[PDB]
């Protein structure tokens, strides 16, 4: 616990001390422009791609 370090009770940690949740959201949209050709959401396979 030297030079601005600290010791923690691994036992307390197990019991739930300072435990946090972490959520992160990922976003996407189907295309921006193309009156005929439009981007699509799908599981991709081969198809020359």
């Amino acid at each position: 616990n030297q030079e601005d370090s600290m010791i923690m009770n691994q036992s307390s940690i197990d019991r739930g001390l300072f435990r946090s949740l972490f959520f992160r959201s990922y976003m996407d949209q189907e295309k921006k422009y193309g009156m005929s050709i439009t981007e699509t959401f799908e599981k991709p396979q081969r198809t020359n791609t």
Binding site: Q10, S11, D14, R15, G16, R19, L21
Partner: protein, 266 residues
Amino acid sequence: EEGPQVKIREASKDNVDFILSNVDLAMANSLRRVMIAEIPTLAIDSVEVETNTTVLADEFIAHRLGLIPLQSMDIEQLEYSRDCFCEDHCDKCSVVLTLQAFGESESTTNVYSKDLVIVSNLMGRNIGHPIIQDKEGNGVLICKLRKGQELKLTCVAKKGIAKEHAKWGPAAAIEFEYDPWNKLKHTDYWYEQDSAKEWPQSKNCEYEDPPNEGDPFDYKAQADTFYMNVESVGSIPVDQVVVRGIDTLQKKVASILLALTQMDQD
């Protein structure tokens, strides 16, 4: 008997107050440590989640489930899964608990460790029953459901020690004190004016004779006579925390003797 000595001051379902005489400091401390970490218990260590339409997240709930106390009386007659010959778990190495809960009432529905149900074949051993001490008989508030809220889960409780996870901790805090008068000068009381006036006297001071100022310091004196209090969580009864403590320690000393025997050939 002959060696270390006992005097049980207080005895309850969850607390032992005792005096350990004719013991070296190391032994009292080692036994204190072993009670804290090395005694096996059974705790939830796998949660299969089918439905969780609750406020709380799957793992948050799973976390609590591990902390829920479970009958570990007959724990020595249940294998560690790691040693079990089965592929995964079985009736010899694990206990399966099920939890199904749905918000029936308009009023907030509560989920208790009592609401957990053993599905495993216990084969007549006092194991896996969730520990209830609650007057009202509910024990542990796992979760709270509202209305359309459902929580369907399965859980396998396995054998383990607090050293791997504190959820297998069979004891709470363990009170430990030797030499309440500081006749050994094992500590140096910090003060402003007077150590005696400034430091609160110990409960255990009435168990030892006071120093007597008109006497010099005892140099050959040694740390022997300990005022310990063991508190159980309820997984195992108090006596067993100390008996299994004593045992587990001797068990692991014996393994060392055994290892010397093993390496003594090839």
